[PDB]
Design an enzyme around this catalytic site. Structure first.
Site, mmCIF file in Angstrom:
data_model
loop_
_atom_site.group_PDB
_atom_site.id
_atom_site.type_symbol
_atom_site.label_atom_id
_atom_site.label_comp_id
_atom_site.label_asym_id
_atom_site.label_seq_id
_atom_site.Cartn_x
_atom_site.Cartn_y
_atom_site.Cartn_z
ATOM 1 N N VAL A 156 43.774 36.953 48.828
ATOM 2 C CA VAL A 156 42.387 36.514 49.068
ATOM 3 C C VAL A 156 41.571 37.530 49.867
ATOM 4 O O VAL A 156 42.129 38.478 50.422
ATOM 5 C CB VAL A 156 42.335 35.166 49.831
ATOM 6 C CG1 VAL A 156 43.066 34.074 49.059
ATOM 7 C CG2 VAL A 156 42.897 35.290 51.253
ATOM 8 N N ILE A 205 36.033 34.022 50.793
ATOM 9 C CA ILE A 205 34.867 34.495 50.000
ATOM 10 C C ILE A 205 35.196 35.077 48.617
ATOM 11 O O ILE A 205 34.283 35.441 47.883
ATOM 12 C CB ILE A 205 33.990 35.496 50.793
ATOM 13 C CG1 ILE A 205 34.760 36.768 51.169
ATOM 14 C CG2 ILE A 205 33.441 34.839 52.053
ATOM 15 C CD1 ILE A 205 33.889 37.844 51.778
ATOM 16 N N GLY A 206 36.482 35.142 48.262
ATOM 17 C CA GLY A 206 36.941 35.713 46.987
ATOM 18 C C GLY A 206 38.460 35.654 46.881
ATOM 19 O O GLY A 206 39.141 35.565 47.901
ATOM 20 N N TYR A 210 46.376 40.098 44.137
ATOM 21 C CA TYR A 210 46.721 40.469 45.517
ATOM 22 C C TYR A 210 46.904 39.295 46.506
ATOM 23 O O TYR A 210 47.883 39.258 47.268
ATOM 24 C CB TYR A 210 45.656 41.439 46.071
ATOM 25 C CG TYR A 210 44.206 40.947 46.019
ATOM 26 C CD1 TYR A 210 43.666 40.172 47.053
ATOM 27 C CD2 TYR A 210 43.367 41.281 44.950
ATOM 28 C CE1 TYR A 210 42.353 39.721 47.010
ATOM 29 C CE2 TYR A 210 42.050 40.840 44.903
ATOM 30 C CZ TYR A 210 41.546 40.058 45.934
ATOM 31 O OH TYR A 210 40.240 39.614 45.895
ATOM 32 N N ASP A 223 39.056 51.698 38.173
ATOM 33 C CA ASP A 223 38.508 50.371 37.927
ATOM 34 C C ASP A 223 37.023 50.315 38.295
ATOM 35 O O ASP A 223 36.558 49.329 38.870
ATOM 36 C CB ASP A 223 39.332 49.305 38.678
ATOM 37 C CG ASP A 223 39.269 47.912 38.022
ATOM 38 O OD1 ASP A 223 38.793 47.765 36.879
ATOM 39 O OD2 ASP A 223 39.738 46.939 38.653
ATOM 40 N N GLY A 264 42.175 36.805 44.223
ATOM 41 C CA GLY A 264 42.731 37.692 43.192
ATOM 42 C C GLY A 264 44.253 37.703 43.137
ATOM 43 O O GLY A 264 44.911 36.900 43.802
#
Ligand SMILES: CCS(=O)(=O)Nc1ccc2c(c1)[C@H](/C(=N/c1ccc(CN3CCCCC3)cc1)c1ccccc1)C(=O)N2
Length: 260
Positions: free
Chosen positions: A19, A12-13, A17, A124, A15
């Site tokens: 997933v 679902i996303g 890092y 952030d 980065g």
């Protein structure tokens, strides 16, 4: 792929890092969001993750558990699944109403207040890190750049977070450390501006030009859409380039726009 009580399903996303994936718990009939980190990509992290697991607030995304095979690369952080996802992505075509932005500002402030009382600075805060809950409230997410502190504030030297949300003092040749709580107010100010305009107050594709704007240009409110003088006042105080006079969370909570 089965990871103890979770069936890992679709992504679902993504980065730096690694997933985030749906994780189905059959024994509960609940889906979760599993953040899969790479240890090679990341000693101190184990302690920081342990602090995050202690956090409990309605405007902070709950870290449910951590799974780890020490002999292997992956580190699995299981969180509550918020299927509405990030409340906003910037830039966007149409912003929120002023009235809607207010309800979301209240959420962020309460969440931030709670984090600061727990001696954490987020570093952030931004719209894409605010997940929309099924109850209509946003929850602060992504603690990858956050720092725990002792005393009344964090004292910081290194920069971290997203350029467009970094406060002037964090990117200026200070020869001096800066306060972490005021960084979070600034970032929330940038976020607030994004809520009503759908775009950051300082924009440039060239990082040195972005930094110049953050440090040297005043906030300029677009002629449309119109916003209230009271919101303008709050945004200018939150985006005060001087952290010494920049409004604090206690006063934000008492601001007429916030309370109206
Ligand atoms: C950016 C936050 S993070 O660092 O990934 N941390 C985090 C923690 C807890 C979470 C999440 C992330 C999500 C999370 N939820 C989410 C992300 C994207 C959607 C929309 N997609 C659209 C395509 C089909 C599947 C659903 C719905 C929900 C998420 C993951 C990755 C980036 C941004 C948002 C969630 O539901 N719970």
């Amino acid at each position: 792929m089965q990871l103890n009580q979770y069936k890992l399903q679709s992504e679902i996303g993504k980065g730096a890092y690694g997933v985030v994936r749906l994780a189905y718990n059959e024994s509960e009939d609940r889906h979760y969001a599993m953040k899969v980190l790479s240890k090679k990509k990341l000693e101190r992290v184990y302690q920081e993750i342990a602090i995050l697991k202690k956090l409990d607030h309605v405007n902070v995304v709950k870290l449910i558990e951590v799974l780890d095979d020490p002999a292997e690369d992956n580190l699995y952080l299981v969180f509550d699944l918020l299927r509405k996802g990030p409340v906003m992505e910037v830039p966007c075509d149409k912003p929120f109403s002023e009235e809607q932005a207010r309800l979301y500002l209240r959420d962020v402030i309460l969440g931030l207040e709670y984090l600061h009382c727990q001696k954490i600075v987020h570093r952030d805060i931004k719209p894409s890190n605010l997940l929309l809950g099924d109850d209509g409230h946003v929850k602060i997410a992504d603690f990858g750049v956050s720092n725990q502190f002792e005393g009344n504030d964090a004292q910081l030297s290194s920069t971290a977070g997203t350029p467009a949300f970094m406060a002037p003092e964090a990117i200026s040749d200070s020869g001096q450390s800066f306060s972490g709580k005021a960084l979070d107010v600034w970032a929330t100010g940038v976020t607030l501006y994004c809520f009503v305009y759908g775009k950051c107050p300082f924009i440039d594709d060239f990082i040195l030009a972005l930094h110049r704007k953050i440090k040297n240009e005043p906030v300029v409110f677009p002629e449309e859409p119109e916003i209230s003088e009271e919101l303008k006042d709050l945004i200018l105080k939150m985006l005060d380039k001087n952290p010494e006079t920049r409004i604090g969370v206690p006063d934000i909570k008492l601001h007429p726009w916030v309370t109206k």
